[PDB]
Amino acid sequence: PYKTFEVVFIVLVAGSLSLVTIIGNILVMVSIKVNRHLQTVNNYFLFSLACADLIIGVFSMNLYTLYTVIGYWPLGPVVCDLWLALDYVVSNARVMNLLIISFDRYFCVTKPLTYPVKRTTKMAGMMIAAAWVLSFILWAPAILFWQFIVGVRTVEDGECYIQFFSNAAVTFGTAIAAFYLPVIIMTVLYWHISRASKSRIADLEDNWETLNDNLKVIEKADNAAQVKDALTKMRAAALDAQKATPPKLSPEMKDFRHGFDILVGQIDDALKLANEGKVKEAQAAAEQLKTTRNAYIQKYLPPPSREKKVTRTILAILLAFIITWAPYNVMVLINTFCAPCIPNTVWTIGYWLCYINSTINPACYALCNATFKKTFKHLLM
Ligand SMILES: CCCN(CCC)C[C@@H]1CCCCN1CCNC(=O)N1c2ccccc2C(=O)Nc2cccnc21
Numbered sequence: 001p002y003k004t005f006e007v008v009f010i011v012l013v014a015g016s017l018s019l020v021t022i023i024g025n026i027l028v029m030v031s032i033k034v035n036r037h038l039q040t041v042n043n044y045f046l047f048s049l050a051c052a053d054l055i056i057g058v059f060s061m062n063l064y065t066l067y068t069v070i071g072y073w074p075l076g077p078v079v080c081d082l083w084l085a086l087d088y089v090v091s092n093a094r095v096m097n098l099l100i101i102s103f104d105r106y107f108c109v110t111k112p113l114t115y116p117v118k119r120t121t122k123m124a125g126m127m128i129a130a131a132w133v134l135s136f137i138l139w140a141p142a143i144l145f146w147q148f149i150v151g152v153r154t155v156e157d158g159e160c161y162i163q164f165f166s167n168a169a170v171t172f173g174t175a176i177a178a179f180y181l182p183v184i185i186m187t188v189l190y191w192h193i194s195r196a197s198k199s200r201i202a203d204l205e206d207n208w209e210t211l212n213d214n215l216k217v218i219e220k221a222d223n224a225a226q227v228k229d230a231l232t233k234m235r236a237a238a239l240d241a242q243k244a245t246p247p248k249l250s251p252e253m254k255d256f257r258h259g260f261d262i263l264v265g266q267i268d269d270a271l272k273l274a275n276e277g278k279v280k281e282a283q284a285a286a287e288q289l290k291t292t293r294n295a296y297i298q299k300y301l302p303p304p305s306r307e308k309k310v311t312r313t314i315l316a317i318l319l320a321f322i323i324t325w326a327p328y329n330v331m332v333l334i335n336t337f338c339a340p341c342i343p344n345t346v347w348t349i350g351y352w353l354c355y356i357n358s359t360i361n362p363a364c365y366a367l368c369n370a371t372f373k374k375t376f377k378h379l380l381m
Contacts, residue, residue, distance in 0.1 A: 007069060010065070010068065010069060011065065011069060014061065014062075014065040015065075017057075017061060017352075017355070017356070017359055018057050018058070018061040018062055018065075020359060021053060021054070021056070021057030021061065021355075021358055021359040022054065022057045022058060024053075024359070024361075024362035024363070024366070025050040025051075025053045025054040025057060025358075025361070025362055026054060027362070027366070027376055027379065028046065028047070028050040028362050028365075028366050028372070029047060029050050029051065029054065030379060031366070031372055031375040031376060031379065032046070032047050032050075034375065034379070035371065035374075035375045037371055038371055038372065038375060039121070041104070041119050041120070041121060041123075041124040042101075042104075042310070044121060044124040044125060044128065045097060045100060045101050045104070045124065045128065046365050046366075048093075048097050048128040048131070048132075049094065049097050049098075049101075049317075049361060050361070050362065052090050052093055052094050052097070052358070053358035053359075053361050053362075055086070055090050056087075056090060056355055056358040057355075057358055057359070059083065059086060060083070060086070060087050060090075060355060061355050061358075063083050064351060064352075064355070067160065068348065072158035072159065073158055073159055073160040074158075077153065077155065080155070080160035081143055081144050081147075082144075083160070084143050084160065084161075084162055085139060085140045085143040085144055088139040088140075088143060089132075089135045089136050089138075089139045089140055090135075091354075092134075092135035092138060092139055092178065093131055093132050093135040094321070095178060095179070095182050096131040096134065096135060097128065097131055098182070098186060098317065098318065098321055099182055099185065099186065100127055100128065100131060101314065101317065102185070102186045102189040102190065102314070102318065103189065104119070105189070105190075105193055105310070105311065105314050106189045106190075106192060106193055108307070109192070109193050109196045109197055109307075109311075110192065110196055142164065143162060146162075146163050146164050147163065150163070168336040168337070171332060171335075171336055172333070172336055175329055175332055175333060179325065179329050180329070183322055186318050186322075190311075190314065190315060190318060193311055193314070194311065197307070197308060197311060201244075201246070201247055201302065202305060202308070204240075204241070204244045205241075205244075205301075205302075207237040207238075207240050207241040207244070208237070208241060208301070210233065210234075210237040211233075211234045211237040211238060211241075211293070214230040214231075214233050214234045214237070215230075215234070215286055215289070215290055215293075217230040218230050218231065218234075218282070218283055218286045219283065219286075221279065221283065222279075223279065224274050224275070224276075224277040224278075224279055224282075227270075227274045227279055227282050227283065227286075228271070228274050228275065231267060231270055231271045231274055231282070231286070232271065234267055234286075234289075235264055235267045235268070235271070238260050238263050238264045238267060239260075239264060241260060242257060242260035242261070242264070246300045246301070247302055248300055255299070256296065256299075256300050259292060259295065259296040259299075260296075262292060263289065263292055263293065266285060266288065266289045266292065267289065269285060270282040270285035270286055270289065273285060313364070313365050313368065313369075316364040316365065316368075317361065317364050317365060320357055320360055320361060320364050321357055324353050324354055324356060324357035324360070325353070325354050325357060327346075327349065327350045327353055328350035328351065328353065328354055331346065331347060331350050
């Protein structure tokens with residue numbers, strides 16, 4: 001009845017997903033291989049990840065669409081086991097790749113003196129190569145030759161699944177060792193990445209990125225309530241940052257406190273200028289505010305926190321994987337003891353959620369980066 005338009009919707013949306021995934025990860029790979037500034041170790045890891053996501057976008061998405069649309073596996077047992085081995089090797093390589101990224105960042109933050117000089121491109125490529133090789137050797141022979149190990153192929157004609165995952169014990173231990181334990185590891189690692197990068201001026205200097213981002217908000221405002229809110233928040237950041245001693249430690253130091261003494265005054269001038277709705281006038285006043293700021297940046301401020309945004313990106317990738325892959329693993333755990341508890345619709349949701357992770361990774365690391373955006377504009381134009 002209604003399932004015809006449902007099928008058309010399925011092939012359209014699925015094809016769109018696959019195409020967007022292919023375009024995104026291909027753009028990442030070409031951008032890294034072309035731009036020399038994108039040839040750092042972080043982008044080596046992101047290159048391996050983009051490769052896995054491209055493999056998922058080219059094969060697994062279209063093969064799963066074929067399975068759901070046709071209602072059974074129409075290609076054959078050889079192709080079925082090839083696709084099972086491929087999906088498993090690629091997922092395991094994804095987990096190990098994310099672990100490599102997490103440990104790399106953790107060592108970069110916890111050993112700032114000894115570790116950075118050891119980070120070379122040869123070590124990065126050697127470790128990602130070891131990751132793919134380990135995943136392949138672990139999963140491929142079992143999935144491809146278990147039928148010959150037991151002397152029988154129990155997979156029915158038209159279906160596609162793994163025989164040795166019939167025992168709930170191997171599914172549970174595999175779920176613990178392959179997903180949950182690595183996720184806990186990544187959580188602790190990122191937690192120490194955040195705690196170790198937290199102390200001193202940075203915590204207190206966050207007020208400065210606060211008045212900066214609020215300045216940018218003032219630039220793109222539309223009414224007096226927006227510049228009022230951002231302006232008061234700027235006043236809070238300036239007042240907390242005023243009684244904050246900079247690292248360079250009265251003569252030429254009353255300069256530092258005098259700069260905030262004038263800054264809060266200009267924030268008051270623009271705030272009373274905003275209480276009656278002079279929006280653009282308050283914005284220009286905020287520009288002169290940015291001039292005074294500029295003076296005191298170039299006078300008494302340490303270098304910016306480029307590594308902190310890197311931590312933000314790491315969190316983006318890890319949260320992408322964890323959030324997108326949690327439902328499927330939960331469905332596996334529940335399926336170990338209650339099969340009718342998980343309908344086929346929600347199974348489909350889990351599958352497409354992992355694949356969607358492969359779709360959204362480039363937006364996590366590449367679309368928020370200035371260099372990747374420059375290379376993208378260069379490649380598309
Ligand atoms: C049964 C395979 C179905 N698959 C189709 C293959 C043709 C689609 C699936 C789901 C969408 C993504 C593609 N595959 C996933 C294959 N992976 C898989 O299962 N598991 C994983 C394997 C390695 C690393 C992590 C996991 C893991 O996260 N959980 C886990 C826990 C316990 C048992 N197996 C898995």
